[PDB]
Amino acid sequence: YARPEWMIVTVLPVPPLSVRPAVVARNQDDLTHKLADIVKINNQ
Amino acid sequence: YNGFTGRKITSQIFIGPTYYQRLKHMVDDKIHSRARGPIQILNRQPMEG
RNA sequence: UUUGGCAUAGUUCC
Protein backbone atom coordinates (compact mmCIF):
# COMPACT_ATOMS: atom_id res chain seq x y z
CA TYR A 1 0.00 0.00 0.00
CA ALA A 2 2.93 2.41 0.43
CA ARG A 3 6.12 1.72 -1.52
CA PRO A 4 9.02 3.97 -0.41
CA GLU A 5 9.86 5.45 -3.82
CA TRP A 6 6.28 6.65 -4.32
CA MET A 7 6.91 9.43 -1.79
CA ILE A 8 8.95 11.25 -4.46
CA VAL A 9 6.31 13.10 -6.47
CA THR A 10 6.80 12.62 -10.21
CA VAL A 11 3.12 12.72 -11.25
CA LEU A 12 1.03 15.48 -9.68
CA PRO A 13 -2.71 14.84 -9.24
CA VAL A 14 -5.04 17.65 -10.29
CA PRO A 15 -8.17 17.99 -8.14
CA PRO A 16 -11.44 18.02 -10.10
CA LEU A 17 -13.48 21.14 -10.78
CA SER A 18 -15.60 20.40 -7.70
CA VAL A 19 -12.67 20.78 -5.30
CA ARG A 20 -11.73 24.14 -6.88
CA PRO A 21 -15.00 25.64 -8.15
CA ALA A 22 -15.22 28.67 -10.38
CA VAL A 23 -16.60 31.93 -8.99
CA VAL A 24 -19.53 33.85 -10.47
CA ALA A 25 -16.98 37.76 -13.94
CA ARG A 26 -15.27 34.38 -13.56
CA ASN A 27 -12.61 34.04 -10.87
CA GLN A 28 -10.07 31.27 -10.34
CA ASP A 29 -9.20 29.87 -6.93
CA ASP A 30 -5.86 29.91 -5.15
CA LEU A 31 -5.45 26.24 -6.05
CA THR A 32 -6.11 27.04 -9.70
CA HIS A 33 -3.58 29.87 -9.70
CA LYS A 34 -0.93 27.65 -8.11
CA LEU A 35 -1.71 24.87 -10.61
CA ALA A 36 -1.31 27.32 -13.50
CA ASP A 37 2.04 28.50 -12.13
CA ILE A 38 3.24 24.92 -11.63
CA VAL A 39 2.30 23.83 -15.14
CA LYS A 40 3.93 26.98 -16.55
CA ILE A 41 7.21 26.15 -14.81
CA ASN A 42 6.90 22.50 -15.81
CA ASN A 43 6.48 23.15 -19.53
CA GLN A 44 9.27 25.74 -19.41
CA TYR B 1 -55.36 47.12 44.55
CA ASN B 2 -55.49 43.97 42.46
CA GLY B 3 -56.62 44.54 38.91
CA PHE B 4 -58.66 41.43 38.19
CA THR B 5 -60.43 41.03 41.54
CA GLY B 6 -60.38 44.58 42.93
CA ARG B 7 -59.11 43.46 46.34
CA LYS B 8 -56.28 45.21 48.16
CA ILE B 9 -52.89 43.54 47.89
CA THR B 10 -51.68 42.64 51.37
CA SER B 11 -48.15 43.95 50.86
CA GLN B 12 -47.73 47.60 49.93
CA ILE B 13 -45.84 48.14 46.69
CA PHE B 14 -42.92 50.47 45.98
CA ILE B 15 -43.92 52.63 43.01
CA GLY B 16 -42.53 55.81 41.48
CA PRO B 17 -41.33 57.49 38.29
CA THR B 18 -38.03 56.06 37.04
CA TYR B 19 -36.25 56.93 33.79
CA TYR B 20 -36.19 53.95 31.44
CA GLN B 21 -34.49 53.36 28.09
CA ARG B 22 -35.49 51.34 25.04
CA LEU B 23 -32.44 49.47 23.81
CA LYS B 24 -31.61 48.80 20.17
CA HIS B 25 -32.23 45.04 20.50
CA MET B 26 -35.70 44.19 19.20
CA VAL B 27 -37.22 40.81 18.37
CA ASP B 28 -38.36 41.52 14.83
CA ASP B 29 -34.67 41.91 13.93
CA LYS B 30 -33.69 38.67 15.70
CA ILE B 31 -36.37 36.07 14.89
CA HIS B 32 -35.11 33.52 12.37
CA SER B 33 -36.13 30.07 11.12
CA ARG B 34 -35.15 27.71 8.32
CA ALA B 35 -36.44 24.56 6.63
CA ARG B 36 -34.61 23.54 3.43
CA GLY B 37 -33.39 26.89 2.19
CA PRO B 38 -30.35 27.99 0.16
CA ILE B 39 -27.14 25.96 0.24
CA GLN B 40 -23.43 26.83 0.14
CA ILE B 41 -21.40 26.15 -2.98
CA LEU B 42 -18.11 24.56 -1.88
CA ASN B 43 -19.48 22.22 0.83
CA ARG B 44 -23.13 21.97 -0.30
CA GLN B 45 -24.14 22.75 3.30
CA PRO B 46 -26.71 25.38 4.34
CA MET B 47 -25.68 29.01 4.07
CA GLU B 48 -24.55 31.14 7.01
CA GLY B 49 -26.41 34.24 8.09
C1' U C 1 -35.88 31.47 -8.99
C1' U C 2 -32.05 32.11 -8.55
C1' U C 3 -26.91 32.36 -5.06
C1' G C 4 -19.83 36.01 -5.12
C1' G C 5 -15.47 35.31 -1.70
C1' C C 6 -11.49 37.58 1.69
C1' A C 7 -10.22 40.87 5.48
C1' U C 8 -11.27 44.42 9.55
C1' A C 9 -14.38 46.76 13.17
C1' G C 10 -18.35 46.98 16.59
C1' U C 11 -22.26 44.53 19.51
C1' U C 12 -25.33 40.48 22.25
C1' C C 13 -25.11 36.17 25.54
C1' C C 14 -22.67 33.03 29.04
UniProtKB/Swiss-Prot annotation, chain A:
PTM statement from Swiss-Prot or TrEMBL: The tandem heptapeptide repeats in the C-terminal domain (CTD) can be highly phosphorylated. The phosphorylation activates Pol II. Phosphorylation occurs mainly at residues 'Ser-2' and 'Ser-5' of the heptapeptide repeat and is mediated, at least, by CDK7 and CDK9. POLR2A associated with DNA is specifically phosphorylated at 'Ser-5' of the CTD by CDK7, promoting transcription initiation by triggering dissociation from DNA. Phosphorylated at 'Ser-2', Ser-5' and 'Ser-7' of the CTD by CDK9 (P-TEFb complex), promoting transcription elongation.
Tell where it localizes: Nucleus; Cytoplasm; Chromosome
- Taxonomically, which superkingdom? Eukaryota
Subunit description: Component of the RNA polymerase II (Pol II) core complex consisting of 12 subunits: a ten-subunit catalytic core composed of POLR2A/RPB1, POLR2B/RPB2, POLR2C/RPB3, POLR2I/RPB9, POLR2J/RPB11, POLR2E/RPABC1, POLR2F/RPABC2, POLR2H/RPABC3, POLR2K/RPABC4 and POLR2L/RPABC5 and a mobile stalk composed of two subunits POLR2D/RPB4 and POLR2G/RPB7, protruding from the core and functioning primarily in transcription initiation. Part of Pol II(G) complex, in which Pol II core associates with an additional subunit POLR2M; unlike conventional Pol II, Pol II(G) functions as a transcriptional repressor.
Instruction: Tell me the function of this protein.
Output: Catalytic core component of RNA polymerase II (Pol II), a DNA-dependent RNA polymerase which synthesizes mRNA precursors and many functional non-coding RNAs using the four ribonucleoside triphosphates as substrates. Pol II-mediated transcription cycle proceeds through transcription initiation, transcription elongation and transcription termination stages. RNA-dependent RNA polymerase that catalyzes the extension of a non-coding RNA (ncRNA) at the 3'-end using the four ribonucleoside triphosphates as substrates. An internal ncRNA sequence near the 3'-end serves as a template in a single-round Pol II-mediated RNA polymerization reaction. May decrease the stability of ncRNAs that repress Pol II-mediated gene transcription.
Give the record's family classification.
Answer: Belongs to the RNA polymerase beta' chain family.
Q: What is known of its domains?
A: The C-terminal domain (CTD) serves as a platform for assembly of factors that regulate transcription initiation, elongation, termination and mRNA processing.
Q: What is this protein called?
A: DNA-directed RNA polymerase II subunit RPB1
Curated annotation (Swiss-Prot), chain B:
* Modification N6-methyllysine, positions: K24
State where the protein is found: Nucleus
Name the domain of life this protein comes from: Eukaryota
TM ranges are none
| Subunit structure and binding partners | Component of the RNA polymerase II (Pol II) core complex consisting of 12 subunits: a ten-subunit catalytic core composed of POLR2A/RPB1, POLR2B/RPB2, POLR2C/RPB3, POLR2I/RPB9, POLR2J/RPB11, POLR2E/RPABC1, POLR2F/RPABC2, POLR2H/RPABC3, POLR2K/RPABC4 and POLR2L/RPABC5 and a mobile stalk composed of two subunits POLR2D/RPB4 and POLR2G/RPB7, protruding from the core and functioning primarily in transcription initiation. Part of Pol II(G) complex, in which Pol II core associates with an additional subunit POLR2M; unlike conventional Pol II, Pol II(G) functions as a transcriptional repressor.
Which purpose does this protein serve, as stated in its record?
A: Catalytic core component of RNA polymerase II (Pol II), a DNA-dependent RNA polymerase which synthesizes mRNA precursors and many functional non-coding RNAs using the four ribonucleoside triphosphates as substrates. Pol II-mediated transcription cycle proceeds through transcription initiation, transcription elongation and transcription termination stages. RNA-dependent RNA polymerase that catalyzes the extension of a non-coding RNA (ncRNA) at the 3'-end using the four ribonucleoside triphosphates as substrates. An internal ncRNA sequence near the 3'-end serves as a template in a single-round Pol II-mediated RNA polymerization reaction. May decrease the stability of ncRNAs that repress Pol II-mediated gene transcription.
Family according to the record: Belongs to the RNA polymerase beta chain family.
This protein is called DNA-directed RNA polymerase II subunit RPB2
Coverage span on the entire protein: 1029 to 1077 of 1174
